[PDB]
Amino acid sequence: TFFWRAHTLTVLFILTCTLGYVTLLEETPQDTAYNTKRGIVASILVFLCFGVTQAKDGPFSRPHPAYWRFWLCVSVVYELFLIFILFQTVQDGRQFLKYVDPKLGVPLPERDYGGNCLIYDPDNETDPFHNIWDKLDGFVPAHFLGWYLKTLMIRDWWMCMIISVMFEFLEYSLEHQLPNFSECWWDHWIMDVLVCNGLGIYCGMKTLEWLSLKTYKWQGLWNIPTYKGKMKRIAFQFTPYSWVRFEWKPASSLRRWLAVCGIILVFLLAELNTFYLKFVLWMPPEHYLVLLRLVFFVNVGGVAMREIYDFMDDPKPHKKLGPQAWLVAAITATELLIVVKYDPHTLTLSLPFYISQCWTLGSVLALTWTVWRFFLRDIT
Amino acid sequence: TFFWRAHTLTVLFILTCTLGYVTLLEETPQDTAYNTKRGIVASILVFLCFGVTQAKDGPFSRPHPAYWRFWLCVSVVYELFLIFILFQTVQDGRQFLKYVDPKLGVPLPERDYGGNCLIYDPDNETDPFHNIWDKLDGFVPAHFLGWYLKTLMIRDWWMCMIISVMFEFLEYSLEHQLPNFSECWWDHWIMDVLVCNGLGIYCGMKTLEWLSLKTYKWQGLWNIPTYKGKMKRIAFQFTPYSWVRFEWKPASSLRRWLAVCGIILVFLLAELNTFYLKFVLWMPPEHYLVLLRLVFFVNVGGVAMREIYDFMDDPKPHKKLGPQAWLVAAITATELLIVVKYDPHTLTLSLPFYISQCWTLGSVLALTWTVWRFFLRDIT
Ligand SMILES: CCCCCC/C=C\CCCCCCCC(=O)OC[C@H](COP(=O)(O)OCCN)OC(=O)CCCCCCC/C=C\CCCCCCCC
Ligand SMILES: CCCCCC/C=C\CCCCCCCC(=O)OC[C@H](COP(=O)(O)OCCN)OC(=O)CCCCCCC/C=C\CCCCCCCC
Ligand SMILES: [Ca+2]
Ligand SMILES: [Ca+2]
Numbered sequence: 001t002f003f004w005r006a007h008t009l010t011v012l013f014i015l016t017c018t019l020g021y022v023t024l025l026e027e028t029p030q031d032t033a034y035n036t037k038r039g040i041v042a043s044i045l046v047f048l049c050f051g052v053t054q055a056k057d058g059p060f061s062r063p064h065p066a067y068w069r070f071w072l073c074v075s076v077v078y079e080l081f082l083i084f085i086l087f088q089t090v091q092d093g094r095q096f097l098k099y100v101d102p103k104l105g106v107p108l109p110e111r112d113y114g115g116n117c118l119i120y121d122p123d124n125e126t127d128p129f130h131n132i133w134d135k136l137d138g139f140v141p142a143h144f145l146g147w148y149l150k151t152l153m154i155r156d157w158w159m160c161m162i163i164s165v166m167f168e169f170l171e172y173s174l175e176h177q178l179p180n181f182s183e184c185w186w187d188h189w190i191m192d193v194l195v196c197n198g199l200g201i202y203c204g205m206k207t208l209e210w211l212s213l214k215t216y217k218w219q220g221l222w223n224i225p226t227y228k229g230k231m232k233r234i235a236f237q238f239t240p241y242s243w244v245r246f247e248w249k250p251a252s253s254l255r256r257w258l259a260v261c262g263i264i265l266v267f268l269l270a271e272l273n274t275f276y277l278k279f280v281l282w283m284p285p286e287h288y289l290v291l292l293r294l295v296f297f298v299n300v301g302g303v304a305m306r307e308i309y310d311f312m313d314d315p316k317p318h319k320k321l322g323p324q325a326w327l328v329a330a331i332t333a334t335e336l337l338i339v340v341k342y343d344p345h346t347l348t349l350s351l352p353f354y355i356s357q358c359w360t361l362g363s364v365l366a367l368t369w370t371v372w373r374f375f376l377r378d379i380t
Numbered sequence: 381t382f383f384w385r386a387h388t389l390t391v392l393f394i395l396t397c398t399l400g401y402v403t404l405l406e407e408t409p410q411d412t413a414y415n416t417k418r419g420i421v422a423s424i425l426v427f428l429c430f431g432v433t434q435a436k437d438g439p440f441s442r443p444h445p446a447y448w449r450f451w452l453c454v455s456v457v458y459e460l461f462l463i464f465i466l467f468q469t470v471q472d473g474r475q476f477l478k479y480v481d482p483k484l485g486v487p488l489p490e491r492d493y494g495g496n497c498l499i500y501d502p503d504n505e506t507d508p509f510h511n512i513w514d515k516l517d518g519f520v521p522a523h524f525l526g527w528y529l530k531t532l533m534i535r536d537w538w539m540c541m542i543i544s545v546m547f548e549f550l551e552y553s554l555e556h557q558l559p560n561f562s563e564c565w566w567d568h569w570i571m572d573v574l575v576c577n578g579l580g581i582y583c584g585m586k587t588l589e590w591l592s593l594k595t596y597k598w599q600g601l602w603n604i605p606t607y608k609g610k611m612k613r614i615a616f617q618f619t620p621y622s623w624v625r626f627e628w629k630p631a632s633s634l635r636r637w638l639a640v641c642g643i644i645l646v647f648l649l650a651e652l653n654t655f656y657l658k659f660v661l662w663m664p665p666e667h668y669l670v671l672l673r674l675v676f677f678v679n680v681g682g683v684a685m686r687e688i689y690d691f692m693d694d695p696k697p698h699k700k701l702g703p704q705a706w707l708v709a710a711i712t713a714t715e716l717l718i719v720v721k722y723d724p725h726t727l728t729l730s731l732p733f734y735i736s737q738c739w740t741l742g743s744v745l746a747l748t749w750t751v752w753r754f755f756l757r758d759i760t
Contacts, residue, residue, distance in 0.1 A: 086403055088412070330395075
């Protein structure tokens with residue numbers, strides 16, 4: 001347990017010695033294009049170190065609060081870079097991304113995915129599943145893990161299913177304002193919504209039930225029994241300390257209902273601007289930046305979701321929202337503003353009439369539900 | 381007291397609305413040289429806002445913890461910029477400072493100040509004080525305020541006087557390794573050390589005694605009596621909540637003595653690298669950057685000095701040093717490394733023999749004092 005309360009002046013000394021050595025004893029190259037990137041990277045690294053060693057501890061502790069402090073600092077850095085990218089012109093921002101990786105900044109080609117439907121197709125005699133084969137890509141294994149983590153983040157069945165359904169309706173309405181969207185109805189539902197609910201959401205709820213019926217008693221690593229107990233402790237150190245499963249009961253007040261609606265809206269906007277950011281900044285879907293963003297968003301979303309539940313469930317008259325939820329909301333707003341700024345012509349396309357009627361019907365149905373809620377509250 | 385517990389989501393909404401307006405509804409200029417500076421400034425402003433609204437509260441509260449959070453964030457930004465400047469070449473760093481202000485990046489002329497001594501000089505019959513007149517500049521009014529604040533920061537007589545004396549000896553030894561240093565012996569002592577001890581240090585100790593014999597009882601701004609009480613409360617709101625005067629007793633152990641020596645060394649290095657930074661980065665002494673650095677260092681030094689006293693005086697087995705002291709130490713180390721890197725040829729000049737003998741005598745005297753301390757501890 002030495003590392004769990006280790007000193008910070010030792011970290012300061014190590015950092016100072018390392019940077020002093022690498023700056024003085026080495027030879028500085030005579031080109032500014034490399035030294036500028038080196039300085040930016042060094043500043044980012046030092047900020048990460050200082051935050052890891054001196055930031056606040058979040059609600060999550062295991063495996064080490066330094067992990068969540070590191071992710072908080074990464075969130076801060078990402079927000080700063082997002083704002084810097086926002087405040088420039090579009091082509092200069094794309095060239096800045098080209099500075100990040102020397103392959104971006106060029107118009108990538110566009111292709112359609114849902115061009116082939118009717119799985120039982122006699123077009124290709126050799127393979128009946130010729131239409132399915134192209135669909136069976138890394139997306140399907142990604143959906144299971146993604147929704148497993150996203151249902152570990154929010155810890156509710158109804159909220160999770162409503163978020164998934166709302167996002168799928170939004171994706172269908174999003175098809176003509178972003179041409180890469182092309183999915184058949186079977187691929188839309190059976191391949192995505194069916195798979196998520198059947199496997200990812202179900203496994204997340206099973207994990208919550210399994211690890212919410214456990215006794216959390218821990219002791220030292222050297223007081224445990226022989227190698228069997230050693231391996232048991234090593235494996236279980238990455239299991240959570242103790243959680244409180246969230247219970248979002250929205251039909252009890254008005255502010256609580258609006259707060260649940262707001263967090264649902266933020267969750268939807270996260271995925272919306274994820275897709276629109278991978279589109280408008282001219283980054284390929286398989287670029288490592290997108291995967292890094294996904295991992296960071298998974299971790300930061302879990303922490304911020306716990307923090308916003310803690311803020312929402314408090315009985316005290318005035319509580320300040322945790323910094324992680326604030327940072328996630330700021331990042332989402334900045335990403336949405338970037339998306340609106342960079343490509344407004346493609347985003348401003350008018351909705352299809354036949355789906356706009358359905359959207360209006362849903363809106364009026366929600367309004368009727370709200371007024372009926374008010375009526376029943378008045379009666380009671 | 382509305383602002384003392386006001387909401388943070390309101391701040392987030394205001395920031396998001398203002399940045400979205402200034403980015404979208406305005407027209408982005410078609411030059412990257414202005415947009416890059418605009419983006420950097422916007423990122424700095426957003427980081428300042430987020431830190432002010434969501435950082436940790438330091439030991440100092442009055443007039444508002446937001447003030448000290450703002451100074452902590454400024455410290456973070458200054459450290460990051462210092463490291464970025466460090467990791468480049470010397471000429472590129474000077475041109476970066478030229479980017480900060482379009483007049484820097486040029487070799488400024490060098491002049492001597494202590495070229496005229498012997499105040500009672502019959503060289504100029506018209507004015508006997510012709511030598512004094514050039515000396516009587518803004519430096520003397522600056523010394524009083526500077527040492528008043530610096531003795532409010534450390535809250536001790538002996539430590540303050542020893543720091544002043546050590547810094548003056550260091551300045552005298554620093555004359556040939558930095559040519560701008562030129563002061564006559566009277567200007568060295570009577571004009572600086574005499575004035576500080578007579579006025580600044582004495583007024584600081586008088587203020588500490590006066591405001592350490594006060595009863596700190598406060599109430600609301602609307603429960604006070606009429607306009608007399610209103611003005612009294614308005615004036616006294618900027619008076620401190622309640623302080624605990626530090627008492628540095630170094631002759632009790634060895635770790636405590638070494639800690640006092642370390643904080644004295646950091647205090648000396650702060651002024652050393654202040655002068656060497658204003659010299660080596662080609663900034664004129666009267667540039668606003670130097671004054672901003674002085675103000676920031678005054679505030680951050682006070683906060684970090686309280687934090688390091690709190691860390692040093694704790695009885696608990698393990699306490700983490702406050703972030704402000706960590707940041708001040710990091711900034712001092714980074715500034716010293718920049719000074720060593722940029723102009724090593726001027727700094728590496730061999731010290732004068734006649735003063736090197738005095739320095740060796742002082743060092744051996746300190747060693748004898750330490751061994752006598754060990755001898756007396758062994759006897760007792
Ligand atoms: C921290 C708690 C959650 C995680 C628990 C364990 C933490 C460590 C696990 C790390 C494992 C890395 C996972 C690798 C990434 C991965 O598997 O895929 C990422 C998956 C797969 O991508 P998909 O979008 O599903 O596929 C697109 C199909 N067209 O992506 C995702 O998970 C998306 C996550 C979105 C997160 C949204 C964040 C917003 C959450 C809350 C904010 C809401 C409200 C709070 C804010 C403000 C309140 C006022
Ligand atoms: C916060 C507590 C202290 C201030 C109290 C009130 C705060 C608000 C007051 C703001 C007023 C602004 C003052 C304007 C600036 C001013 O008057 O002059 C600045 C003066 C005048 O300049 P001089 O160097 O004296 O003249 C040169 C002569 N050759 O400059 C200074 O005050 C120098 C201050 C140096 C401070 C050093 C900081 C380091 C302190 C502690 C760190 C040490 C240990 C902790 C770190 C690590 C521990 C392991
Ligand atoms: Ca889909
Ligand atoms: Ca002097």
